[PDB]
Amino acid sequence: VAVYHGKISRETGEKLLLATGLDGSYLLRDSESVPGVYCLCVLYHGYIYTYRVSQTETGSWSAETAPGVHKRYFRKIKNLISAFQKPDQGIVIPLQYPVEK
Amino acid sequence: VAVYHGKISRETGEKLLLATGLDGSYLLRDSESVPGVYCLCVLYHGYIYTYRVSSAETAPGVHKRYFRKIKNLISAFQKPDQGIVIPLQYPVEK
Amino acid sequence: VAVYHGKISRETGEKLLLATGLDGSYLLRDSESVPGVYCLCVLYHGYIYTYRVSQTETGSWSAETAPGVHKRYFRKIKNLISAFQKPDQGIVIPLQYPVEK
Amino acid sequence: VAVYHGKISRETGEKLLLATGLDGSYLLRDSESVPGVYCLCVLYHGYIYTYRVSQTETGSWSAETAPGVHKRYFRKIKNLISAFQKPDQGIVIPLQYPVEK
Numbered sequence: 001v002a003v004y005h006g007k008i009s010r011e012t013g014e015k016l017l018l019a020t021g022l023d024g025s026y027l028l029r030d031s032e033s034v035p036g037v038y039c040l041c042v043l044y045h046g047y048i049y050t051y052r053v054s055q056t057e058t059g060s061w062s063a064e065t066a067p068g069v070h071k072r073y074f075r076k077i078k079n080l081i082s083a084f085q086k087p088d089q090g091i092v093i094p095l096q097y098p099v100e101k
Numbered sequence: 102v103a104v105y106h107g108k109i110s111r112e113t114g115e116k117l118l119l120a121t122g123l124d125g126s127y128l129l130r131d132s133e134s135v136p137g138v139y140c141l142c143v144l145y146h147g148y149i150y151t152y153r154v155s156s157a158e159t160a161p162g163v164h165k166r167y168f169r170k171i172k173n174l175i176s177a178f179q180k181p182d183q184g185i186v187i188p189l190q191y192p193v194e195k
Numbered sequence: 196v197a198v199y200h201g202k203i204s205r206e207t208g209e210k211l212l213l214a215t216g217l218d219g220s221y222l223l224r225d226s227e228s229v230p231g232v233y234c235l236c237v238l239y240h241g242y243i244y245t246y247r248v249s250q251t252e253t254g255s256w257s258a259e260t261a262p263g264v265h266k267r268y269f270r271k272i273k274n275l276i277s278a279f280q281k282p283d284q285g286i287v288i289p290l291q292y293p294v295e296k
Numbered sequence: 297v298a299v300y301h302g303k304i305s306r307e308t309g310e311k312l313l314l315a316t317g318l319d320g321s322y323l324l325r326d327s328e329s330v331p332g333v334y335c336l337c338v339l340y341h342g343y344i345y346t347y348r349v350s351q352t353e354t355g356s357w358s359a360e361t362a363p364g365v366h367k368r369y370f371r372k373i374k375n376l377i378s379a380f381q382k383p384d385q386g387i388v389i390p391l392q393y394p395v396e397k
Contacts, residue, residue, distance in 0.1 A: 002317070004317070005315075005316055006315045006316070006317075007315040007316050007319055007395070008316050008321075008393065009396075012318070012393050014317065015393075016393070041319055051332065082358045100317070101317060101318060101319045101341065101342075
């Protein structure tokens with residue numbers, strides 16, 4: 001996943017996204033608060049929105065958005081990312097500009 | 102809930118916890134990412150750990166507990182082995 | 196100051212000191228009675244002894260101790276704390292075991 | 297120097313930088329070739345760039361950069377690292393994202 005950057009902190013990922021200044025800039029990183037979980041981080045109007053991404057026991061991927069709403073599950077994280085490029089998936093703005101480096 | 106601080110930002114919350122300088126200091130604040138969700142924020146070894154409360158989202162493999170009252174959730178997380186990095190120890194109330 | 200723990204109440208700071216069970220354990224906390232003043236709190240024989248610590252208009256620091264004790268002023272609070280690790284300074288026992296976290 | 301990681305190998309250092317996937321990610325490690333010399337290691341477009349950093353006869357620090365570059369010397373290694381956060385210092389990309397842990 002070119003947008004996944006392991007071994008970077010929340011602060012680094014936010015500085016990078018903020019530098020882009022583009023709505024829908026995004027990256028994936030490791031959660032610092034919960035080992036084993038990931039954070040899908042999205043810039044919108046100068047603020048970073050962070051959504052927890054995790055795998056089920058059998059390996060399916062989902063993002064936590066509104067509480068208590070049925071999630072969509074994906075075999076592959078790239079398919080999760082693709083789905084969240086569309087509107088009304090539950091994040092503040094669609095994923096549009098991947099931070100790959 | 103005495104440790105709940107509404108309206109304040111993540112940065113304000115983190116500064117408050119860092120001002121305590123104690124492992125296990127904690128507060129509750131509003132999520133900036135998901136409206137209507139809260140964040141249970143805990144200081145440990147100089148780092149803030151944030152757990153969404155919305156029940157608390159903790160380490161996978163932990164039996165999720167549910168509480169009628171947030172004050173009873175807070176009390177439960179004052180004990181070990183609840184899925185957060187260190188038990189809740191010192192409330193930041195004001 | 197590593198022994199300074201802001202934004203915690205008297206009750207919380209005293210419970211923490213008592214948990215250590217060590218004579219000469221100490222911390223510095225915010226006064227809840229007078230904004231801007233601090234409380235140097237020392238455990239001795241199961242009780243907490245509290246001494247007000249404040250900074251003057253000139254930046255100097257001093258502690259209110261036993262009466263009849265010559266009041267000492269310090270440029271820096273860290274130097275006040277070090278001074279009170281020595282014997283015969285007007286507190287119940289010298290500062291010995293800093294509560295730092 | 298928070299980006300300094302002693303007692304780690306070239307291999308460990310490079311694996312860690314590559315994992316970040318961010319241009320300008322950097323760390324300082326021990327040279328395995330020359331005891332007491334260091335290596336400033338920087339990720340850029342998928343490649344690790346390694347610049348030797350050493351202290352002189354009389355205690356100043358410098359990095360070996362591109363030929364032709366006017367070599368700067370530093371009393372403090374943190375000031376060396378700050379200078380190399382700017383462009384046109386002789387390395388392939390400025391230092392941007394410190395690997396601190």
